[PDB]
Amino acid sequence: ISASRKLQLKTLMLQIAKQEMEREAEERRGEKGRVLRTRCQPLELDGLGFEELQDLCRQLHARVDKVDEERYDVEAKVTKNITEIADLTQKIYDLRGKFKRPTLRRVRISADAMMQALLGTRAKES
Amino acid sequence: TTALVCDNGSGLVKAGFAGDDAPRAVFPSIVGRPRHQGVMVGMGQKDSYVGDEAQSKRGILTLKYPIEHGIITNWDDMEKIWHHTFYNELRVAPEEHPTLLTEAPLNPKANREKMTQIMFETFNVPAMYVAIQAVLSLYASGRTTGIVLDSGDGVTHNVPIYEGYALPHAIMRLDLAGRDLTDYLMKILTERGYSFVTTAEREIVRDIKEKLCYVALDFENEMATAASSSSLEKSYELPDGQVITIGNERFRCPETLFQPSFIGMESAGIHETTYNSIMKCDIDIRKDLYANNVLSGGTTMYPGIADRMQKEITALAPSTMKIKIIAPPERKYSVWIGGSILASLSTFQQMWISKQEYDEAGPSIVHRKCF
Amino acid sequence: TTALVCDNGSGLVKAGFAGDDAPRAVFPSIVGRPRHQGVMVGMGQKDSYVGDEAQSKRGILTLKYPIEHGIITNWDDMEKIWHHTFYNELRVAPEEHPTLLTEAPLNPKANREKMTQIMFETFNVPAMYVAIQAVLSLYASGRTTGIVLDSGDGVTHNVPIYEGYALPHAIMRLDLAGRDLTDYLMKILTERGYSFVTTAEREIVRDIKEKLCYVALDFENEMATAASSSSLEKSYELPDGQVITIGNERFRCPETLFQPSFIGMESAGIHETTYNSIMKCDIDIRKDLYANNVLSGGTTMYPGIADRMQKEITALAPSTMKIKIIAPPERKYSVWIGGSILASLSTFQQMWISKQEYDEAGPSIVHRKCF
Amino acid sequence: DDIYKAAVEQLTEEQKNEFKAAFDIFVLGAEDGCISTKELGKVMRMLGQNPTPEELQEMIDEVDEDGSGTVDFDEFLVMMVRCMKDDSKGKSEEELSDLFRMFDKNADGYIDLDELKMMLQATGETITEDDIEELMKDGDKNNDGRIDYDEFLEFMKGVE
Amino acid sequence: GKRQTEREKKKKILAERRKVLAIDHLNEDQLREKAKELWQSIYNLEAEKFDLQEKFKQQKYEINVLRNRINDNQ
Ligand SMILES: Nc1ncnc2c1ncn2[C@@H]1O[C@H](COP(=O)(O)OP(=O)(O)O)[C@@H](O)[C@H]1O
Ligand SMILES: Nc1ncnc2c1ncn2[C@@H]1O[C@H](COP(=O)(O)OP(=O)(O)O)[C@@H](O)[C@H]1O
Ligand SMILES: [Ca+2]
Ligand SMILES: [Mg+2]
Ligand SMILES: [Mg+2]
């Protein structure tokens, strides 16, 4: 087929994928806030005797400890995963890289300048 | 911004922006003051013509190269050459461009330190990095192993590399190069009657060497043939007429590479220093070095050298190993192409010697981690 | 689920899932850091190549075994080897698989305790069990009695067993093994001119030993024959050419097994420590041990050892007893095949050291009932 | 490549007639009726620009698929606009890689052609099943039935 | 011991995260403020753990990609 339609397809796919990924990320953030507020529950016990206040404080200190231990273990595991992922990435590159060196061209100077230089003095309209 | 990949060399300065295929401006590195008196007034006569301008007025100049053997012997002239290269051949002020010089292996430290001090104080570049001239030539071939013989015009050096790990104890640097071949050719031309003495006529002898000389596959047979027939005598027209005829001087000039006893040097030829450089390497990477022998540099452009060298090494090496000699057609600019590739890499972008680092440690920063 | 039958060994790590015939991945246990500088940027050079990868880049590495004589001398490297074995050669996470390591007899306790602590804390296996390397080799032969001589690469040990009841007072462990034979061969090769020094060239000498050496049926006659004729001189091509010719070094290298005085060791050969191990047993099970002598381990693969050993023992033993030497063709992997058989048994399924048990008693659980 | 084909399809008879007149003026006296690789290279060297003859061979192979070394009108315009390579760098790499990775909604490591079908329905550009088939052929080099991630890099390589 | 070092390091991070919850001497509003501090810490850790989960899902899919390419690189 024509190549212009193919380029239009390519850029349209770029836009489609970008917009869908962005909307998915937005939904992830919204659900993150929603579910976390559903998990972290606000309290209100002002004016109470300091015994109950301190009981709540100790309970929430323990809860802080639990959440910190869990999340920090998860973060350590995820960091290990990311390290292993990087190792595999390097391995696959070394297996299939090498030839991966790009080439840059500055020889292709502006074509209008080329036309001007060739036509010399007669380079008036082109 | 873009990086400036300069390459001082010795005989031809090659420069250009990083990321292209060929250097933008290539011109001899000679600075020649006029030597006669000068009677016309107001002719606009300068005090020193550098670069390619002094190859056109060479009739009344005394050209003198500022780089003898890799090392730089005349710092003022080298500064003048760099200033010309930046401002007139590229027309880019150095205040806005990183630079990537190149240096031969085993050179004096003071040369490198003075080079970085000049680049940081006079031209005031943002950041400069100095690289060994052989690793770049290995970049350009797209390999990652191999032993590269970079026979420039100043000095011939032979750096073996395996899997990206250079072997510092196996670098064999020999000071025979194109300039000594020019002098020897100028010395053997006197056997027919042609005397070239002036420093300007050295350029004519260099042109003769480039256009006519070739490396013989077998030396004795060629010496016997040239002494009986006359099928070798090729003629050449001087810059004023009076054609000359070169006989068996054709393959005797570049033969000095394989027998440095001709110019009185003791060492062994470029065919045997490569084998010695290989044999110093470990016993398990010798096959790969045998199979990936790389040629570079200008002087390895003689017609018929990639066969003579292969024959010699095959004679020296064990009979089982395969000897292959990589001789790309873009040999002359191989170092600069490799320099462009290296400067265009993203992984390399943090190895430059930033100016604040130089301000904190002085010119001796180049020997440190930022090599 | 399935069990992982790992077998650390010393020289070759053999691993694979329980219930098969042969180990899935067999690769040398060496960890070699690079030793040169390295000039190519972005080549993706790692800091330590382990396993079979470092047997291909050994030209620029310094290989060092993490297990000297059965015992483990460098725990970080051993942990690296285990991590490689689990994740890249088998690609099974250890969180879902029991493991069955193997250990030589009479080894230091701290080695075994550290091994179990690593397996439970770092890799976090569900349950692991440590077994003596000779009982497995007896499993693989399908016997239930017999005295097994497991001459590995690290240490040679000789465990007699009768009717399933091991005799702990008759285990004779000797520290001569394949590695000392490699060193002695590398030391006697110097008598012809070939010098191997680098830790990489030890691998080449090991290959020479594997492919050429053989055990002589009678030592003096072979020494006399090799000194007159030339029918023994077998040649071998190094990794770069320059073939070498091994004369009477062929049967002198593995002769050290039967005369440990060659490498200065005091003790008696493997032909006499077996007889001594038998004579320590009770007087009524000596006939069965005589008739069921089992060979195992890599180093017992020399061509012609099953006859020399039988001749020697028949010389030592009383004339009436029948001496038979079981030498299965699958000698090298005999220990691992036995390990697979043992791990596949239903009766054995409750002997594993479960993780909750380790949490309650610490690493010293291994010396307890769960042996 | 066909990038310049798309660029000239964007262009109209103005560029066609402008380059036709430029041919009439400068290629005047040439016995060709087109522009040869050697002629173009020599003329470039005459004006000052010195591309490699390997580039001449590459360009002639690209525009002149028949290998004649000449330039048919469409491929002539493609070759002429090939000199001015204004658009480079091929859009973004890692972000587009993430977009393609999330394109595998099934997340199996396989990009079904039906996901592409739905995305194209979203685009709605004038395309038939044979057109998307041909595009996938240009993309699915190994013919694994999906869009390979390496082949995803390949088909979007240099693509803005 | 490197593994000893890891276990001790995680335990020390745990110990560091344990603040001095000696607050009974304070008044009602200050105790409310402290409880809010703990609540905010918990919710922030919730956000961090959510990010960990989504990024680990991405890590797993990319390891699938890696394994597929390993299969491709035969
Ligand atoms: N085509 C050629 N044939 C033979 N010799 C050549 C040719 N071109 C250059 N040379 C020699 O090589 C030298 C140029 O070498 P070059 O690679 O520029 O040195 P550098 O490493 O300093 O750049 C010249 O002096 C000349 O003697
Ligand atoms: N075919 C062979 N011939 C002679 N010696 C061998 C042969 N195969 C292996 N060996 C020796 O045995 C050693 C391997 O022994 P192995 O049984 O793997 O030890 P481990 O008990 O640690 O696994 C090697 O180092 C080598 O020296
Ligand atoms: Ca999909
Ligand atoms: Mg050079
Ligand atoms: Mg063993």
CB atoms within 10 A of CB D160: 14
Instruction: Give the Cβ contact number of residue D63 at 10 Å.
Output: 23
B133 shares a domain with B13:
yes
What three-state secondary structure class fits C327?
Answer: coil
Chains touching E (3+ CB pairs < 8 Å): A, C, D
Using the structure block, give the residue that is written with the tokens 């991966």: A100
* Residue C35 distance to chain B (closest CA, Å): 9
For residue B23, give the chain D residue with the closest CA: D50
Structure letter (DSSP) for residue D160: -
Return the structure tokens found at D91: 């859009």
Which residue, chain included where needed, has tokens 């087109």? D34
Q: Cβ(B153) to ligand 1 under 6 A?
A: yes
DSSP for C2-38? Answer: PPB--B--SS-EEE-BTTSSS-SEEE---EEEE-S--
Same domain, C17 and C121: yes
Contact D51, A108 (CB under 8 A): yes
Cα C145 from Cα C292, distance rounded (Å): 7
- Do residue B11 and residue B129 come from a single domain? yes
Alpha helices in chain A (DSSP H): 3-39, 50-96, 111-119
Within 22-51 of C, beta carbons closer than 8 Å to B belong to 34, 36-43, 45
**Distance from first CA to last CA of chain D, Å, rounded?**
13
CATH for C345: 3.30.420.40
Which of B30, B149, B174, B301 has most ligand 1 atoms within 8 Å of its beta carbon, as the pocket-test mutant?
Answer: B301
Question: Which residues in B lie closer than 8 A to residue C33 (C-beta atoms)?
Answer: none
Rounded Cα distance between A30 and C226, Å, is 86
State whether B12 and B130 are in the same domain: yes
Measured distance between the N- and C-terminal CA atoms of chain E, rounded to whole angstroms: 39
D64 appears as a binding residue in the annotation: yes
Q: Does D88 touch chain B (CB under 8 A)?
A: no
CATH of the domain at C232: 3.90.640.10
Ligand 1: centre distance to CA B181 (Å): 11
Tell me if C336 sits within 8 A of C7, measured CB to CB.
Answer: yes
How far apart CA B192 and CA B117 sit, in angstroms, is: 49
B330 interfaces chain D, CB cutoff of 8 Å: no
C185 vs C179: CA distance, rounded Å = 10
Choose the closest CB to E23 out of A57, A71, A76. Answer: A57
A64-99 CB burial, b ≥16 within 10 A, e <16 = beebbeebbebbeebeebeeebeebeebbeeeeeee
Work out the burial of residue A121: count CB atoms within 10 Å of its CB; fewer than 13 is exposed, 13-18 middle, 19 or more buried.
exposed
C-alpha C73 chain-centroid distance: 16
Say whether D106 counts as a known binding-site residue.
yes
What count of residues does chain A have? 126
> Long-range contact list for E25-28, CB < 8 A, 24+ apart?
E28/A46, E28/A47, E28/A48, E28/A50, E28/A53
Phi/psi for A89 (5° steps) reads -60, -45
Q: Is B16 left (phi over 0), alpha (psi -120 to 50) or beta?
A: left
- For helices B178-188 and B201-212, the axis angle rounded to 10 degrees is 100
Interface of C to A at Cβ within 8 Å reads 44, 46
Asked if C10 and C128 sit in the same domain, the reply is yes
Residue in E closest to A37 by C-alpha: E43
Touching subunits for chain D (3+ Cβ pairs under 8 A):
A, B, E
Q: What's the CA gap between B315 and D155, in Å, rounded? A: 49
Interface test with B, best of A95, A100, A103, A105 (most B CBs within 10 A): A103
Angle between helices A50-96 and E28-72 (to 10 degrees): 20
Q: What secondary structure letter does DSSP report for C50?
A: E
Is the C-alpha dihedral spanning B287, B292, B298, B299 positive or negative? Answer: positive
Q: Are C23 and C12 in contact (CB under 8 A)?
A: no
Q: Are C36 and B165 in contact (CB under 8 A)?
A: yes
Which tokens hold the place of C305? Answer: 């050892």
C-alpha to C-alpha distances, C273 to A59, B127, C170, C258, C266, nearest whole angstrom: 69, 72, 10, 10, 12
Tell me how far apart the alpha carbons of residues B68 and E59 are, in angstroms, rounded to a whole number: 57
Establish whether residue B302 lines the binding site of ligand 1, counting it when its CB lies within 6 angstroms of any ligand atom.
yes
Joined tokens for residue A100: 């991966």
Residue type, C197: V
CA distance B79 to B123: 9
Q: Between chains, do E68 and D109 touch, taking CB under 8 Å as contact?
A: yes
Q: Are C17 and C4 in contact (CB under 8 A)?
A: yes
Burial class (CB in 10 A: 0-12, 13-18, 19+), C145: middle
CA-CA distances (angstroms) from residue C176 to C122, C149, C155, C184, C325? 33, 13, 6, 11, 21
Q: Which residues contact E70 (CB under 8 A, 6 or more apart)?
A: A92
Contacts of E7 in chain C (CB under 8 A): 121
Give the torsion through C-alpha atoms of C354, C355, C357, C362, to 10 deg: 130
Q: Indicate whether B11 and B119 sit together in one domain.
A: yes
Establish how many alpha carbons lie within 13 A of residue B185's alpha carbon, considering only the half-sphere containing its beta carbon.
Answer: 30
> How large is the C-alpha radius of gyration of chain B?
22
Place of tokens 């790692």: C46
**Among all chains, which residue has been given the structure tokens 């309970």?**
A59
Contact B119/B24 with Cβ under 8 angstroms?
no
DSSP lists the bridge partners of residue C281 as none
Atom of ligand 1 nearest to the CA of B211: 3
Sheet of strand B49-50, all strands in order from the earlier edge strand to the far edge: B49-50, B31-34, B61-64
State the structure-solving technique.
Answer: cryo-EM
Q: Judge whether C317 and C326 are in contact, CB under 8 Å.
A: no
Residue nearest to atom 3 of ligand 1 (CA): B210
D66 is in an annotated binding site: yes
**One domain, residues B10 and B128:** yes
- Written as six digits, the tokens of B282 are 């470990």
CA atoms within 13 A on the CB side of C70: 23
Are the Cβ atoms of C239 and B351 closer than 8 angstroms? no
Residues with Cβ within 8 Å of C80's Cβ and at least 6 positions away in sequence, in order, are C31, C48, C50
Tokens 């910190």 locate to: A68
Q: Quick one: CA dihedral B255, B259, B264, B268, positive or negative?
A: positive
Q: Report d(CA C212, CA B39) in Å as an integer.
A: 89
CB count within 10 Å of CB B126 equals 17
E3/C118 touch (CB, cutoff 8 Å), yes or no: yes
Tell me, in angstroms, the distance from the centre of ligand 1 to residue C336's CA. Answer: 64
Alpha-carbon span B342 to B338, nearest angstrom = 6
Asked if B53 contacts B84 with a C-beta cutoff of 8 angstroms, the reply is no
Cβ(B51)–Cβ(B14) under 8 Å? no
* Residue C259 · residue C272 · CB < 8 Å: no
Angstrom distance (rounded) from CA C286 to CA C162? 10
Q: How many CB pairs below 8 Å do chains C and E form together? A: 7
Q: Which residue has the tokens 């020289």?
A: C11
Q: How far apart are CA B3 and CA C146, in angstroms?
A: 76
D24 is in an annotated binding site: no
| 3-class secondary structure per residue, chain B | CCCECCECCCCCEEECECCCCCCCEEECCCEEEECCCCCCCCCCCCCCEEHHHHHCCHHHEEEECCECCCCECCHHHHHHHHHHHHHHHHCCCHHHCCEEEEECCCCCHHHHHHHHHHHHHCCCCCEEEEEEHHHHHHHHCCCCCEEEEEECCCCEEEEEEECCEECHHHCEEECCCHHHHHHHHHHHHHHCCCCCCCCCHHHHHHHHHHHHCCCCCCHHHHHHHHCCCCCCCEEEEECCEEEEEECCHHHHCHHHHCCCCCCCCCCCCHHHHHHHHHHCCCCCCHHHHHHCEEEECHHHHCCCHHHHHHHHHHHHCCCCCCCCEECCCCCCCHHHHHHHHHHCCCHHHHCCEEHHHHHHHCHHHCCCCCC
Structure tokens at E65: 């990609």
The residue type of D2 is D
- CA–CA gap between residue C215 and residue C181 (Å, rounded): 12
Angle (CA) B361 B112 B78, round 5°: 120
Q: Which residues contact A56 (CB under 8 A, 6 or more apart)?
A: A43, A45, E35
C241: left (phi over 0), alpha (psi -120 to 50) or beta: left
Paired residues of C13 in beta bridges: C27
Same domain, C128 and C224: no
Please report the resolution in angstroms: 4.9
DSSP C201-260: HHHHHHHHHHHH----SSHHHHHHHHTT--SS-EEEEETTEEEEEE-THHHHSGGGGT-T
Our CA-based measurement puts residue C352 at a distance from the nearest CA of chain E, in whole angstroms, of 23
Residue D115, annotated as binding a ligand: yes
For C341-350, the CB contacts below 8 A with 24+ separation are C341/C136, C341/C139, C341/C140, C342/C100, C342/C131, C342/C135, C342/C136, C342/C139, C343/C3, C343/C5, C343/C18, C343/C19, C343/C98, C343/C100, C344/C3, C344/C18, C344/C19
8 A C-beta contact, residue B353 and residue B116: yes
Give the domain range for residue B232.
Answer: 178-256
Count residue pairs from D and E with Cβ separation < 8 A: 20
Burial bucket for residue C243 (CB in 10 Å: 0-12, 13-18, 19+): exposed
**Pocket flag, ligand 1, residue B254 (CB < 6 Å):** no
For C166, the 3-state DSSP assignment is strand
D122/D139 Cα distance (integer angstroms) = 20
- E71 chain-D contacts, CB cut-off 8 A: none
Give, to the nearest 10 degrees, the angle between helix D37-47 and helix A111-119. 80
